[PDB]
Amino acid sequence: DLELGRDRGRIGKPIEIPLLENFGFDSQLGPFYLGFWNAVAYITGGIFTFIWLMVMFAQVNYNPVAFAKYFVVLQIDPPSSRYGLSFPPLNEGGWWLIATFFLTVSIFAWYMHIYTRAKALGIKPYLAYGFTGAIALYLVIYIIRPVWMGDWSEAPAHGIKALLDWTNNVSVRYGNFYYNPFHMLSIFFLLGSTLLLAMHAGTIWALEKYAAHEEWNEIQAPGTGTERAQLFWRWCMGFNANAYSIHLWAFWFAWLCGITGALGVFFSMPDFVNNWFQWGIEAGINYPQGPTPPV
């Protein structure tokens, strides 16, 4: 909310590409807005990107061809379980710690940037309230669970293939994450969000002819376009949701996925749940296992 800039924080002049209008997309790349918070976010993100890329590059002994070849499988490891929450020497966890701190600062600065910019323009800051869910998931996974168990070693490594490896490792270590009451709810909300986006986007694209994509003008005054969507869904399944209600559904279905699932990640530790399949056995939802070998 310092906003720097020349003209209300915006530097430069708009750039217009008329080709994008043909496919249905807006033709202007606007003036760039530089504020305090987005400047901090950009600086911290650049530092994090530099640290990540350079620590990966040093592992292949600065070979560009080997860097390109092994870029996906290269990773930065967190501190080992021996150090707990302490600061290890570099190249064995210090690099991970510095990069994680700067990434957290970048995320918080971006949240402040969107909150401030929504307030400045007069609209309500509902984009930041929704970003709070992704922030919660990231915070839990990276800091809160590791700091709670006192091991940095349970946070994901800094690589493209490292995230997939961490997902598989966490699921395997804590017993078949499919038996997670919150990861089940998380899957419900995520798949429901994808389904919701599919139906809503398909409806609006179909009703493009009736100016149903002008949602701002149809919230206050529906018109024939909104009606030929409400009736479509009412005839399809027996209930509909006007322009305002459907966006509430979208926002809530998207946000709840972060919270229900941050809870799932948080509870997956020896203090609360160690075996999720044993949890399901105690819940009686498993198909019965069977006899042990005779021997």
């Binding site: 720097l4 305090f36 400047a39 020497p89 510095i98």
Partner: protein, 35 residues
């Protein structure tokens, strides 16, 4: 012309100080919090 350049400057003065402090603290002998 100069207000932006002051703020940007500053937030660099801060990020670089944080970076050097972390690198100094992570080094084994220079760790003053382990003894």
């Amino acid at each position: 012309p100069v207000r932006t350049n002051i703020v940007i400057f500053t937030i660099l003065g801060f990020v670089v100080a944080l970076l050097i402090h972390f690198i100094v603290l992570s080094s084994p002998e220079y760790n003053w919090l382990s003894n």
